[PDB]
DNA sequence: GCCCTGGAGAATCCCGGTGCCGAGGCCGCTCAATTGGTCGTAGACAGCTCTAGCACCGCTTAAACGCACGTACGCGCTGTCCCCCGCGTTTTAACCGCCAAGGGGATTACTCCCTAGTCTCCAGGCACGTGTCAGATATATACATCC
DNA sequence: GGATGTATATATCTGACACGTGCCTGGAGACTAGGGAGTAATCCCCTTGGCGGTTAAAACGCGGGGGACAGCGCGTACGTGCGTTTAAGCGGTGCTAGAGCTGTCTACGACCAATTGAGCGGCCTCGGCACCGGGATTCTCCAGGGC
């Protein structure tokens, strides 16, 4: 069997902010755990929000509200701006 | 006659995958139906957070003359902030150590 | 911080 | 069988842990209290892990069972999968 | 006369040394034996992977270090430098573990 | 005059207030304070009465628990009087700061 | 009309009654400002989440369920209001 | 032909509903498919816990010469146990009050 | 619109352990909240357990394991015995 | 306990 | 007699040579992400009803406010004796390296029983009215309790 | 001993709890088609058990300096009581913003068949990092001088 991870994407992101820095395997395991944890938190909060209002679909509004509920401080503002920019760029084409 | 295949990540200008996140959302038993804009937003947020953590960790690693990144540098980067210390306040990092500090009354 |  | 292995947590190990914790001076009655606390914590975690491994009809305790047992009590651990 | 450091000087050096490293501070064989003994009661003829014991050791180390930090704060609050069992009891009571 | 010794009426008050189950804060000032605080995040907001009641109940419970912990901390250091440092230590240990 | 300086409505006797129910015997003179600050921080933290929940539903009235959910988000479950 | 209808709760000898629990489980987004013995087990557990709470609260109410149960009695019953206090250690009860106790040092 | 609660079943249970005791409305609301909370806890734990083992169904065994994980001490033993008796009585007829 |  | 004022031994830092194991790049190839169409329902949007949230005024009294006076408590200074720190020598078991055997985890085929999906019908649970009793109130003892 | 606060007995009276009822939405009974889970057989990876040598770490003992603890005195800050002032609570009117329900229909997401490029598993190699040794600089503790 073959497993799945986020190794290649983490390496791609790292090669953009520090073009001459490597990473070991233990740090990669920690990064995978971090990504999984954040994904689970946001998805669960979005599901609960959708369930409260008697809806049966998950849209970008639910994700935005979940992000504003979870992340603290200026992280919320930056993440919201990045998400809105990405969605607009995707739907323009 | 089919056009050239273009990944959704490239169409949205991201590095993190979009099809994989969509599949995970569909198969995770989160809701009956999943919209078409949720994966893009989620991937963008995840990429932003990862970039934040990696930049701070790389600065910490370069601080004491090293090339690679080890869990100690990640622990230093996380504990030395104020927002990331609140987001990960109930998380243990293996082989991370502790922040060096000593109470002033104990010092001679 | 980083990217706005 | 096995017996009284709680004495394997020697006094120098507790001293080293206190030193990493930032402590400067230690009394002589601390060690027994620390051993009791550690025993209680281990009992809780191991009970949860054994329940998890018994539900799946297995005879080996894996790392994921310990990770789940820790995450259950608000003790998320990174780096073991 | 032999050279002797004044009391409380080697303690600060030990603190500075142990707050800079990242290795484990407990022998592995006694800990493994203790874990097996404790798990004996809930079920018999059990097997453990090495990674499970490693995870248990890391978690226990972190828990004890945090508890000792809180205990030191409690001891300082009462105009002392020595930690005592009542400080551990007060910290565990306030944290909600009792 | 029949001036009681200091610390005698305090025990009577402790016994009296640990037996009843009503609210110990006036309602109009609390409602005004809640409206003032909520004015920052949004404008032209309307509240149901039960919302303000729930907020008052939660605040009462939180403050009583914090005062219990503060009393424990004050007793630990051989004192009877509670001081701000006790509140700060209790909040620090509980994880709120 | 705007509202200003309502934190002084939590008078000293009310704080004394809360301390008495908590079990305190003697109180110093600087406790009241600390108590007011702590209460203000707690109220802001809860009300922010309540208002976010209200906004997501496209409403202008804050209900009791929003407060209940906001409290539940911090491990402070409350029984009685639904 | 169809015989007389017999409710599942009656067939299992319970007082709590079984059809309602099955419907809630099916519409709560918990799993793709739900078995047949889960509702009976869940209803039995819920009934047992309710019986425990109500018996203790009734004893507390009858202690001080009252016929009806009020939230103060429920709070006393919950806080005065050892295993119910652990199950509901983070729950606030409206109009409940506190448990009467005074530190020994304060007492004269 | 008509809503639903657990008032009638709580009343029926109360009339077996104290046949001469009543209950007010506020206590009934508290009991409703308690029942809903416990139901949600057990159902969520069972769903997580079923997801961990690559299964796609919820049976009485997941419910039993969730009850063992949640309830402390002697409550777990009593609840397990009651559930087993109910299931076997249901299956027998 | 109850219902034994 | 005191406040410094240099030396000595131990601890920490810095620099150069080395060799070895893990991080980083390259190649088949196979499973999962893409492109194009179709259909049936979830959610957007406009309009009407009536519940409940906001604003105002007068009055009666319970609670907050202000000032005085005296005593119980917090806090600083001294002295003594037990307990924990620093160091040298002896004894115990952790740790590393290598072998061997068998229990138990992981993967494949297949066959049957358990649960989802439909249609009908009829009884259990909800909304609505109401008459009576458990509980709250007021007042006169009367006994437990503080200075 | 006696003022003050606490427990107790009795008429009564009003609002909330328990009981009755019509009916309509959600639960029950019978049948069926297809995929999820139970069961037998097999391969090989990972856990358990054993032996010997060496060296790092634990255990035992002893002198003494610093810290925990008890006791006493004094002066300020907090508790108790009284007369005066402010605004919370209660009852009643009147107006309208906004929550909650209903009918239509259109755009959006689930589902299926073919096609192909992104990501996973498997060898290979060289440079970043760990380890060693010697020399330069730093930190601590006790001996002396004259201000």
- Please list every residue in chain D whose beta carbon sits closer than 8 Å to the beta carbon of residue E86: none
Give yes or no for a contact between E47 and D59, defined as CB atoms under 8 angstroms apart. yes
Domain G1-82 has CATH 1.10.20.10: yes
Question: In this structure, what DSSP letter does residue G79 have?
Answer: E
Determine the residue of chain B that is closest to H28 in CA distance: B31
Q: Measured in angstroms, what separates residue F20's CA from nucleotide L8's C1'?
A: 20
Given CB atoms, is G75 within the 8 Å cutoff of chain I? no
Buried b (16+ CB within 10 A) or exposed e, D7-34: ebbeeebbbbbbbbbbbbebeeebbebb
Given CB atoms, is B2 within the 8 Å cutoff of chain A? no
Which residues lie closer than 8 Å to H93 by C-beta, 6 or more apart?
Answer: G79, G80, H71, H74, H75, H78, I30
Residue E70 distance to chain F (closest CA, Å): 7
Domain boundaries, chain D: 1-81
CATH architecture classification, A1-93 = Orthogonal Bundle (1.10)
Question: At how many degrees (to 10) do helices I60-70 and I74-92 cross?
Answer: 160
Alpha helices in E1-98 (DSSP H): 9-18, 28-42, 50-77, 85-95
Q: Do chains G and C touch (3 or more CB pairs under 8 A)?
A: no
Reduced 3-state DSSP string for chain H: CCCCCCCHHHHCCCCCCCHHHHHHHHHCCCCCEECCCHHHHHHHHHHHHHHHHHHHHHHHHHHCCCCEECHHHHHHHHHCCCCHHHHCCCEEECCCCCCCCCCCCCCC
Q: Under DSSP, is residue D3 helix (H, G, I), strand (E, B) or coil?
A: coil
Residue E31 distance to chain F (closest CA, Å): 29
Q: What stretches of I1-93 adopt beta strand conformation (E)?
A: 22-23, 57-58
Give yes or no for a contact between I59 and H31, defined as CB atoms under 8 angstroms apart. no
Give yes or no for a contact between I72 and H27, defined as CB atoms under 8 angstroms apart. no
Q: Measured in angstroms, what separates residue G33's CA from nucleotide L35's C1'?
A: 67
Structure tokens at E51: 């990674």
Residue H30 — φ and ψ, nearest 5°? Answer: -110, -40
Question: In this structure, what DSSP letter does residue E44 have?
Answer: S
Q: Under DSSP, is residue D26 helix (H, G, I), strand (E, B) or coil?
A: strand
Nucleotides in chain L near protein beta carbons (<7 Å): 3-6, 16-18, 25-30, 36-37, 46-48, 57-59, 65-69, 77-82, 87-89, 97-101, 108-110, 115-121, 128-129, 140-143
Determine whether the distance from the CB of E30 to the nearest atom of strand L is below 7 Å.
no
Q: Measured in angstroms, what separates residue F17's CA from nucleotide L6's C1'?
A: 16
Q: Measured in angstroms, what separates residue G61's CA from nucleotide K47's C1'?
A: 22
- H/E stretch holding E82 reads strand E82-83
Which residues lie closer than 8 Å to H58 by C-beta, 6 or more apart?
Answer: H69, H73, I14, I17, I18, I21
- H/E stretch holding D12 reads helix D11-21
Structure tokens at E41: 């009661």
Residue B86 — φ and ψ, nearest 5°? Answer: -85, -30
The residues that bridge with H93 in the sheet, in sequence order, are G79
Given CB atoms, is G79 within the 8 Å cutoff of chain I? yes
Taking the domain E24-98, which CATH number applies? Answer: 1.10.20.10
- Please list every residue in chain C whose beta carbon sits closer than 8 Å to the beta carbon of residue A81: 4
The residues that bridge with E90 in the sheet, in sequence order, are none
Reduced 3-state DSSP string for chain B: CCCCCCCHHHHHCCCCCCHHHHHHHHHCCCCCEECCCHHHHHHHHHHHHHHHHHHHHHHHHHHCCCCCCCHHHHHHHHHCCCCHHHHCCCEEECCCCCCCCCCCCCCC
Q: What distance in Å separates the CA atoms of residue B14 and residue B43, rounded to the nearest whole number?
A: 8
Which residues lie closer than 8 Å to D12 by C-beta, 6 or more apart?
Answer: none
Q: What distance in Å separates the CA atoms of residue H53 and residue H77, rounded to the nearest whole number?
A: 8
Given CB atoms, is D21 within the 8 Å cutoff of chain A? no
Q: What distance in Å separates the CA atoms of residue G62 and residue G42, rounded to the nearest whole number?
A: 18
Query: Pick from A49, A86, A89, A84: which is nearest to A65 by CA?
Result: A49
B25:A56 CB<8 A: no
Structure tokens at H80: 């005065």
Q: Under DSSP, is residue D25 helix (H, G, I), strand (E, B) or coil?
A: strand
Task: Tell me the resolution in Å.
Answer: 3.0
Structure tokens at H28: 């709560």
Chains that touch B (3 or more CB pairs under 8 A): A, C, D, E, H
Given CB atoms, is D2 within the 8 Å cutoff of chain A? no
D77:B94 CB<8 A: yes
CB atoms within 10 A of CB H1: 2
Given CB atoms, is E77 within the 8 Å cutoff of chain F? yes
Domain boundaries, chain E: 24-98
Q: Under DSSP, is residue I58 helix (H, G, I), strand (E, B) or coil?
A: strand
Instruction: Kindly list the distances between the CA atom of residue F24 and the CA atoms of B3, F57, F63, G26, in Å, as whole numbers in the listed order.
Output: 72, 10, 11, 19
Which nucleotide in the DNA or RNA is closest to residue E79, CA to C1'?
L68
The residues that bridge with G61 in the sheet, in sequence order, are F46
Rg (CA), chain J: 3
Residue B101 distance to chain A (closest CA, Å): 25
Structure tokens at B15: 């590095």
Give yes or no for a contact between H9 and H16, defined as CB atoms under 8 angstroms apart. yes
Could you say which of 3.30.70.260, 3.40.640.10, 1.10.20.10, 2.40.50.140 is the CATH number of the domain covering D1-81? 1.10.20.10
Give yes or no for a contact between E82 and D27, defined as CB atoms under 8 angstroms apart. yes
- Please list every residue in chain D whose beta carbon sits closer than 8 Å to the beta carbon of residue B53: none
Residue G36 distance to chain F (closest CA, Å): 10
Q: Under DSSP, is residue A4 helix (H, G, I), strand (E, B) or coil?
A: coil
Instruction: Kindly list the distances between the CA atom of residue F38 and the CA atoms of A35, F33, G54, H19, in Å, as whole numbers in the listed order.
Output: 34, 9, 12, 44
Given CB atoms, is E82 within the 8 Å cutoff of chain B? no
CB pairs under 8 A, 24+ apart, for G12-15?
A: G14/F24, G14/F25, G14/F26
Question: At how many degrees (to 10) do helices I25-52 and H71-79 cross?
Answer: 40
Structure tokens at F4: 């009681």
Pairing of strands H68-69, G61-62: unpaired
Q: What distance in Å separates the CA atoms of residue B38 and residue D41, rounded to the nearest whole number?
A: 41
For chain D, the 3-state helix, strand and coil shares in percent, each to the nearest 5, are: 65, 10, 30
Given CB atoms, is G29 within the 8 Å cutoff of chain H? no
CA E39 to chain centre: 21
DSSP string of E10-24, one letter each residue: HHHHHHHHHTT--S-
Residue E95 distance to chain B (closest CA, Å): 14
Domain F23-97 has CATH 3.40.50.300: no
Reduced 3-state DSSP string for chain F: CCCCCCCCHHHHHHHHHCCCCCCCCCHHHHHHHHHHHHCCCCCCCEECHHHHHHHHHHHHHHHHHHHHHHHHHHHHCCCCEECHHHHHHHHHHHCCC
Determine whether the distance from the CB of A32 to the nearest atom of strand L is below 7 Å.
no
The number of C-alpha atoms within 13 Å of F15 and in the hemisphere containing its C-beta is: 8
F76:E77 CB<8 A: yes
Given CB atoms, is F56 within the 8 Å cutoff of chain H? no
Question: In this structure, what DSSP letter does residue I70 have?
Answer: H
Instruction: Kindly list the distances between the CA atom of residue D36 and the CA atoms of D8, D70, E86, G41, in Å, as whole numbers in the listed order.
Output: 13, 19, 14, 38
Q: Taking the CA atoms of E44, E45, E50 and E52 in sequence, report the sign of the dihedral they define.
A: negative
Dihedral angle at the C-alpha atoms of A19, A24, A27, A31, nearest 10 degrees?
60
Interface test with D, best of B75, B77, B94, B99 (most D CBs within 10 A): B94
Burial class (CB in 10 A: 0-12, 13-18, 19+), B35: middle
Q: What distance in Å separates the CA atoms of residue C2 and residue B86, rounded to the nearest whole number?
A: 18
Structure tokens at G13: 């006797």
Determine the residue of chain G that is closest to F58 in CA distance: G78
Determine whether the distance from the CB of F97 to the nearest atom of strand L is below 7 Å.
no
Instruction: Kindly list the distances between the CA atom of residue H104 and the CA atoms of F73, H107, I66, in Å, as whole numbers in the listed order.
Output: 15, 5, 42
Q: What distance in Å separates the CA atoms of residue G75 and residue F67, rounded to the nearest whole number?
A: 19
Query: Pick from F10, F24, F25, F21: which is nearest to F82 by CA?
Result: F10
Q: What distance in Å separates the CA atoms of residue D35 and residue I65, rounded to the nearest whole number?
A: 31
């Amino acid at each position: 069997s073959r497993k799945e991870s986020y190794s290649v994407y983490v390496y791609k992101v790292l090669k953009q902010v520090h073009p001459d820095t490597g990473i070991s395997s233990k740090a990669m395991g920690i990064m995978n755990s971090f990504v999984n944890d954040i994904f689970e938190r946001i998805a669960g909060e979005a599901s609960r929000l959708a369930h409260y209002n008697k809806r049966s679909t998950i849209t970008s509004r639910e994700i935005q509200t979940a992000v504003r509920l979870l992340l603290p401080g200026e992280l919320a503002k930056h993440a919201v701006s990045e998400g809105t920019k990405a969605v607009t760029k995707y739907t323009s084409s | 006659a089919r056009a050239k295949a273009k990944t959704r990540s490239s169409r949205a200008g991201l590095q993190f995958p979009v099809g994989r996140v969509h599949r995970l959302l569909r198969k995770g038993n989160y809701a009956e139906r999943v919209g078409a804009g949720a994966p893009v937003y989620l991937a963008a947020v995840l990429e932003y957070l990862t970039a934040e953590i990696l930049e701070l960790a790389g600065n910490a690693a370069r601080d004491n003359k090293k090339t690679r990144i080890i869990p100690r540098h990640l622990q230093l980067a996380i504990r030395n902030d104020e927002e990331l210390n609140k987001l990960l306040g109930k998380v243990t990092i293996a082989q991370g150590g502790v922040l060096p500090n000593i109470q002033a009354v104990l010092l001679p | 911080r980083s990217r706005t | 069988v096995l017996r009284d292995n709680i004495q394997g947590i020697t006094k120098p190990a507790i001293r080293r842990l206190a030193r990493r914790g930032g402590v400067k001076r230690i009394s002589g009655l601390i060690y027994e209290e620390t051993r009791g606390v550690l025993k209680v914590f281990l009992e809780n975690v191991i009970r949860d892990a054994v329940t998890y491994t018994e539900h799946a009809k297995r005879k080996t305790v894996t790392a994921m069972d310990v990770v789940y047992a820790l995450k259950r009590q608000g003790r998320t651990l990174y780096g073991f999968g | 006369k032999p050279h002797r450091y004044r009391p409380g000087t080697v303690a600060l050096r030990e603190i500075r040394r142990y707050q800079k490293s990242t290795e484990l501070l407990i022998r592995k064989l006694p800990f493994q034996r203790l874990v097996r003994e404790i798990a004996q009661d809930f079920k018999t003829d059990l097997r453990f992977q090495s990674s499970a014991v490693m995870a248990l050791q890391e978690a226990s180390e972190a828990y004890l270090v945090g508890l000792f930090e809180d205990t030191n704060l409690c001891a300082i609050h009462a105009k002392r430098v020595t930690i005592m069992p009542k400080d551990i009891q007060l910290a565990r009571r306030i944290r909600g573990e009792r």
